[PDB]
Amino acid sequence: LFPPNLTRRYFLYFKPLSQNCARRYRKKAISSKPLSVRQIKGDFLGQLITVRGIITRVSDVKPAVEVIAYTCDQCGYEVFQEVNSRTFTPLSECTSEECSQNQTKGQLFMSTRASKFSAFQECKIQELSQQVPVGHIPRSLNIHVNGTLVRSLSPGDIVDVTGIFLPAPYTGFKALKAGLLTETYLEAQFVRQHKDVYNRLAKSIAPEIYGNLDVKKALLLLLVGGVDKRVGDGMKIRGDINVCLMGDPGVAKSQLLKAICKISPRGVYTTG
């Protein structure tokens, strides 16, 4: 009566073959072996592979239609259509047995309340700096996330995405024009994310320079930034301690900035 996908309330994913388990049983694990975007070639299409990189863009979640439910304004029946492509052509005429037998021309109309939607999200994965060859520029690869895997990727994370490498055929005229070149993407299936007190703290702020106790103490005071800012009379005294380093070139200014900016949780490093 209705497609099997309509009543499904679960999503199925494949966890790759772990390296340790493959070595235990004397086998090679292609799925769990990491690859760069460069190594993912055209002969890997249709396989279960893993990619290593940093995510550079994640789109907003949105509903992608799997099964469309229509209704007949005359027959009182409901039709179901399956969509497995970027585009589709909606039904406009009833195909129910009653309509055909009676010949009544009842228009079919869409109903979003009865259809089936799956959360959709599109991401982008870029090569790491250490993976690009000499005198080359990094490349990027699209990723599709469906079901309960959404919101598991954010820009800036270094991840080992495991997915199915598939093409994305064009449709209609664009397919005719495009020739035999094909776009590709990855169907995400599994994601692995990568990882006397004053004097002591000051000396530990940056051990690779020659000690500057006063500067380090002031920088720690900046970092903590303790303040009671509750004037409540219209405005309040500024609640941050600002520090400026000014020195002739040769002293560790940039190193101090880099260290103090890495330590802080919200540190942002910029150049004038």
Partner: protein, 43 residues
């Protein structure tokens, strides 16, 4: 209908026999003569 055309209220009227027909429109959601009039007019 007080609401706009795209509000999207759907109906299910029960015939004397156990079959359900589908009508669209708030007026149908409220009334039955309007539902039958729309049924006739939609032919």
């Amino acid at each position: 209908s007080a609401r706009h055309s795209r509000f999207g209220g759907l109906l299910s009227i029960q015939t004397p026999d156990k079959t359900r027909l589908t009508v669209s429109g708030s007026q149908a959601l409220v009334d039955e003569k309007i539902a039958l009039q729309k049924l006739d007019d939609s032919k």
